[PDB]
Amino acid sequence: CQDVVQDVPNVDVQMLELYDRMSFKDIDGGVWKQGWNIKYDPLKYNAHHKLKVFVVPHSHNDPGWIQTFEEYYQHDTKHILSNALRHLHDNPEMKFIWAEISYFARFYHDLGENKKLQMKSIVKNGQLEFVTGGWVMPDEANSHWRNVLLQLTEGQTWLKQFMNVTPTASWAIDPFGHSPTMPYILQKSGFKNMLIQRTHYSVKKELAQQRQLEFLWRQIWDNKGDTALFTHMMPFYSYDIPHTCGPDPKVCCQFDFKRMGSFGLSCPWKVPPRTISDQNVAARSDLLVDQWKKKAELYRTNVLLIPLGDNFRFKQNTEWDVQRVNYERLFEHINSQAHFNVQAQFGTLQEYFDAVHQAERAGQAEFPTLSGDFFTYADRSDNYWSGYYTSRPYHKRMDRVLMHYVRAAEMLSAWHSWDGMARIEERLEQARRELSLFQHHDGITGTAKTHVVVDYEQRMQEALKACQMVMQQSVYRLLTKPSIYSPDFSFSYFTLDDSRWPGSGVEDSRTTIILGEDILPSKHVVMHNTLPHWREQLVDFYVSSPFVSVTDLANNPVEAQVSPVWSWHHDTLTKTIHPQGSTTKYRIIFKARVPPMGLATYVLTISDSKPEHTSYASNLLLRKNPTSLPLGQYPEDVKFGDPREISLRVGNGPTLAFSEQGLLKSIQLTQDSPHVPVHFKFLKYGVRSHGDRSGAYLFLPNGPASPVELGQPVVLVTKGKLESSVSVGLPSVVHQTIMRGGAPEIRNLVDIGSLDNTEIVMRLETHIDSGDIFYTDLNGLQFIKRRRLDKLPLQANYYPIPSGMFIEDANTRLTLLTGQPLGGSSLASGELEIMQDRRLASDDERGLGQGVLDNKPVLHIYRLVLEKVNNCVRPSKLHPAGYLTSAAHKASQSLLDPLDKFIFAENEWIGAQGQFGGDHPSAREDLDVSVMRRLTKSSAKTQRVGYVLHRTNLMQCGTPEEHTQKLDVCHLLPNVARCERTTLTFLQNLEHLDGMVAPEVCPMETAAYVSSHS
Template sequence: MRCMRSTTIGLIFAVAAIYSVVILFVGDERVSFHSVLRHFPQAPRSVEPPVWVSVEREADADLRVDGTRVELRAPLVFNHSDDEPITVHLVLHSHVDPGWLETFDQYYEHKVHNILNLAVAQLTEHEDLRFIWSEVSFLERWWTLASEEQKKQAKRLVAEGRLEVCGGSWVMTDEATPYFWASIDNLIEGQRFLTETFNVTPRTSWSVDPFGHGSMIPYLLPLAGIDNMVIGRINNELKKDIRQKSLLTLNWQQSWTNGASKDSPKAAFVNVLPNKYYTTSDACGPDLHVCCQFDIGPTARSMCHKRADDVSPQNVAAYAEQLAEQYRKLSKFYRTSSVLVPIGDDFFFSVVEDWTVVYKNYKQLLDYINSNPKYKMNVRFSNVGEFFASVDQKTRSTAPLLSGDFFPYLDDSAGPYPAWTGYYAHLPYHKRMGRIVEEKLRSLDLLRLASGSRNDGLKPALVESRRNLALFQHHDGITGTSRKHVMQDFLQRLYWAFDNVTAAQQQLFGGDSQEKFEAVDFLNDDQGRLLTHRLFQSAEKKESRIVLFNPLTIQSTRRVVVRVNSPKVRVLSGQGKPIQAQILPQILNGTISSEFFDLLFFMPIEPLSRVEVSLSFEETQPPLTSVSRVHSSSSQKSPFERLETGGSFIANNSLLKATFFDGKITQLSLGDQEVGLSFELNKYADRGGAYVFVAGERVALPTLRSFFYVDGPLCRRVFGVSDSVNISHAFSVFSSGDSLVDGSLDLEVLSNVRITVNENYMFSLGTRAIGSNGTFYTDANGLHMMKRRFNSKESVAMNFYPAPSAAFLEDRRLRLSLLTNQPTAVASLASGFFEFMVDRQLSGDDGKGLSFGEADTSLPSRLNYRILLEPRKNVSYGTQSFFHSALGFHSLQDMLYPVTAMVRSSDAPLASWPSLFQGLLPCDVELVTFRFLTENTALALLRRLPFDAHSAAPLPSDCSGALDAFWNLLRARLPGGTLFVSNLTGTQKGESVASGRQFAALFDDAFLIRAIRIELP
């Protein structure tokens, strides 16, 4: 419960300062369509521009939620009658965070194993009792340690529905900051365990503690077979409003629609808890002083002068009268004759007396109420499934339609810490590290597909890695809202996952040949802490062979950067052909290194394929390896030839031009469209904590202590170091001849704010050329884009929204996009401008559970972004945007999913892998994931994307790939496999997919994620 919370971490400098560079440097791959024709001339050229599948229109809805505002299409009047019988479902639960004030292991030892032991024992003893559970991570730990008798009893209780597992995710995820790939994997991991252990698939969801609810979960859950949800934390002022209108029962649909398609996403049926929390004292009705009395048991935490833990024949009538009155009043907040009432709290039911006191006293109360006709009530111990089963179909079908989401979360508008927007970007190092492990796992899954490996020996390491990543998705993990030692535990689990996945990748690269491959090396700073992570090759080795794997499903030109200790290095393709390269300076803390350099080159790689390159260190400078020229504002000595400039610098290629003066960007153009561009660092005084942003004075930090211009044939870069805080940034423009490489401006930010306190650092990015007028868009966890509006009546903090991977603002002529490789927070406080959080360092206690000093350790971070400027065409007034352009999406994919690089130990020819793709997968079809569920079962998730047709940016030059061809190749790659449509997690299969035409027909609808289960002999 977040009336008591705690955060940050210990002192490891590691892999997110780190691996952003394995994203940015060990292979910042660039998706390229034009390069397909250049490097792969056999690819057919499209004669006509591609026609994208479209989202028909914005979905109709009775309620639209936009931040703190709710818009009603009609009055939505609903009349209640006190004569109407109601059924009250008492749902016993325990909210068990798998990491918050204690670590996962500590909580399990101290509380959770007792809760589950007692739940099984008490439900076995009392046939009328029910209990719900949501954190599969804890259930799996309990199961591995339970006795055979306990397992037998638990299986029986689950089969009978008396012990109900809701949601089935490994953890109750945060909903603001994850990328949807990790959320799907979280679901798969939990539901696979439930299917294999209990032979059940959840039908309901219980998600009552995330700090605001987004549109991702009500989209994914119906695809997994769950269309009944209980949620808790929505903006408290908004909740009061809709509660008075009896609107706490809703059908939650997406903000877009595919029209009359039978496969349009199903709206989730949602029951919203009535007050702030999921506790007994907060949920029995509107009078919390009365409800508090019925929060009984020795571990009850509410502050109450009197408790109903002494129910007897003498006082049962008085207690029952109070409780029944609350239940009746509660029912008027809903449009059903059934009411759900939680009984529980954080780690409640951890001692036997909690169970006995609750059962003894509530049993008397419900017996009395049920036997007294005047109440017209049936009160019973129940669970979430039984509650939803009692809601008739007419009520479901007539419940109001909601679209939008419930961000930002506000719990007390009158309090000192109202806006829960700080956690969107808190502890960026941890958030970056989580994204790195996601990328590594996805790449490993696709490596298994590409190599044809069904090596079950990888399973233990993979399972552990997936579960550690899933644990981090918890709403106190990725959010950065746990105590320091708990955040350190989350981080250590991510490191373990990273190491395990890397070791598995080494095995897969070797395949049956038993050849050894080396992973990337780690470089330490002078304090011995892990600071950055790059592919490093030493001149002492003379020659190295590097193998690159492309995890994307389109032919791509990849950016590869290798750290070297000599600039005299030649790059050759696997066929021995020289490759053009450039030596870049390594700049750290405003100083050019004379010992290490970055070697940049580009490589075309087919989808899901490997290529080999070799590095040869020479005595003289190779003619195709250009050494950059460098201008330093501080005139420091360096091994690079000095670039003469008068303070201005143009970083350009055939498509993009960025103009700089004194190290600061002033203009950006794509093609003929040129605009003035502003990019400045700002600092807010922040009186909040890990959860809450409380904006004080805003101070611009425009001065650069030093800047560098770097010039060369493949890369032009501008590196700026802030004068007042240890934050630096680098803009890069690349020249590969590929529109999807050259059409975006790269931005890397290095942040180290540990010596500051109570400050929130942000960059402002924008142009006066775009008249966005307070409207902007942020992504819904990567699934689609959500329209946002600046609200001048709200505080600065309440105008920030989560941006897990993207944001853009636009008018009819231009779109400016910010793509981000780690979750952040974005606002548009002025027309044409973004403000996005970079880092924050806080000492305060925002009253949500973490004490003073728990949010004051943000580790040095290396953060990656892309900036796109796109001309628009044929835009009508009122046009709604739902997604990226083709350029925007594939630039994002390129940043999220870099090449995997390994160093070979052998000089023998590289063993070939059969190509999975003889042609392209259509460029508007995304392979979300492919993973083995078991040695003989695989799951593929794909979706068709509605690219913005109004973009005038460069288009893919070939989108001729065919889904039926992909189906044929998939069958050939997995011989003997039978394909079935399945639910999202692969736990339930539907009709078989018997032909390529049938397979292709599944992808007619925009955004719809299709799951294909492949069963192998």
């Protein structure tokens, strides 16, 4: 196992280092506006060394953006694919590449058998080639690596099954900036090459000058280089035709033959394309070949890639003809004119890469190595695309919730083989597909039109219901005496109870467990733990009486705490935001203990009076002019007082101090230790009154943020033995700090209401001496070192915060973990900030055609970890990576993969069992079974179950942390007959395992195993 901490990889280009040295000057470079006038030596090519040119036709199709997936499919995509089939079938030499399997699968299943065969043959013969092969071309900023793998697997599994092909070349031309998480997953999924396009114009210029646009992209911690994946970065501003034939768009535009008039398109550079003829082909070829040779100067081999396409192109037969015929005329002339020393033809992406490597092997080029990422993207001037790290935050939070439900549903039902009548495979496939679809770069990015966002939401909503159905049927089967188990596959044995989604104040969707002497004395509830280690976590449920006690199934009492159900209201009459307590429902909280990847059953029983093992929280409402707050049977009267500072401590945990406005002020780790200054503050960014406007994509602040005026907010303090919290109703945000004994949890109920052109940010101010350094994660997979650069505008120092960020000095670290991807930064030493929501009245000219005015209440959740790190073994100062501590990592897991809670629906659960998985191995804390998926239907003689195992890397800080069991996923199910290591998509067997034992992976590595059972 490589050491991912102590050895700084040696690479030719390290992006943080490059950023430190680069000037980023935006000067006019001529026709190549962001480059320079390329010159080449005409004698470079000759009869013994020709320029091999591959023109690759393509059509960028968005699975929803301006229209919904289905609208686009009916209006454009089905026509594009139908005509591609006809045209490639009839013109053997024509080629075309396709990226989005969601659309292809939709099309193919609608084809008659005769056309399905024609399609399979033009794929088999190399004319139509799939690039990447994912359900979509995902966003790379906000997406969790788990969902990136999920969507890749969904598209490639379909391709293997129906087209009998597995792409080994990736094509990502529209995501806004690129992440190294892509080559990470791709290289572990059989890929050999990848192509990217949207990277900062300054970066393109810099790498172009050094001919480092093609490189071996390895992970920042990879000292050996085994994670390396050959990567081609396109050099220009766009992937459209004007920006793909060479440096001068005024010239290249003339070779987009769809722009002559009848199609309603034209060249903005005022010179239109002209039909190629025998009288102008020599002159047209002169111009084109010159653009090609200039583009070739930016690369190292004699093989040139010329993409030929744009958004939703190749829709009409006449378009296919006009592009094909004119290019064939050019190729015939050019290839027969020796003086050009060029051989051009239509080709696919893989053809290009194969030729490149052939040149490489012939010793004509050697490629530089590179590590780092390509955020934050700017396509021109100061237009940095960091707004989409936050746009439509409700759905960004929804993404993480569904991510977990999908994993829990696939895992819970994987334990058994199911009769087709159970519709398990059906519901799981629909859930994987709707979540996969949302990974699209206009999905989770929040860059689609309003009605399209609604469509993604409804799809995800159906996906959540599908997961619930599968999960509850699974729990019922897993915890019911086999000879008693009598399932109705359409019945709801349990209903899921989720405390954080949609969340309190977002939607009253939770069911109250209704108990009563005259109706029902008790109720069984079950918790599931998808993580592969024993886990304890407080869980809460709503009950119709405060006199409730909890026991496990051996009938041992469980210490519980009851608290009121508080809801915040913006009182339009008193013009204040204050809480109201329920007089009929209450919250019961207790510690659940659940086996690794298992279940644990508990019972809630009503009593006529305060039960022995249940305590009641005190409540204190701080505000001037208070009014009574009755709580029905709740045994403790609410107390009142004028606003004042407060301190709280739960268990032996930290002690936290709050200001009289209910905001954190300091954290004291231990009895003796100091009260470390940690202050939460809320601010707002505006929009510029002149110049470019912020929109769904762009963050263009009109200067540093200004504090939100808080007035004299109402603060509610609940103090309990198991859980305490401080909540305050601020303008646009009900901010809540919850304490259960460890790092506190922070929840923000964000309702930006109608505050137009406003972006609300949550900031932490500390005295940590971080200087200009901070860390943010990439797709929940790794933490990368960031350096605030004052030579760049504010918005450029914003980065995606998909799951966490931290700052530190020699002695102290503050880590903020998130349950949703948002945008953030550290704009000053000792600071951390993350945007909550943004509402923008204007469009930002990238094609969306609207601002962002469809905001809705969202509940953002976080864990805030203050820790001493002076004893931790950390990477040296030049290492580009950072690593979490055990506490920070578990806090992230508590947000992304919490225990699942199920309430039994009928009055009596006959045959109920108290636990499942008690014998499952409790793996070391840095290991996770990211995916558990049964890969075969019940009719298969040999059952197969796939597992994706990921081991992160946690800092060694002196904690002994011992006694853990080896996890062999190949033996989790009985009767194993074979164990194989496979690509992450489970599509290719890479290793036949001895003793049928799946070994554990190394720190920062991910492996997939498939066990076969007889």
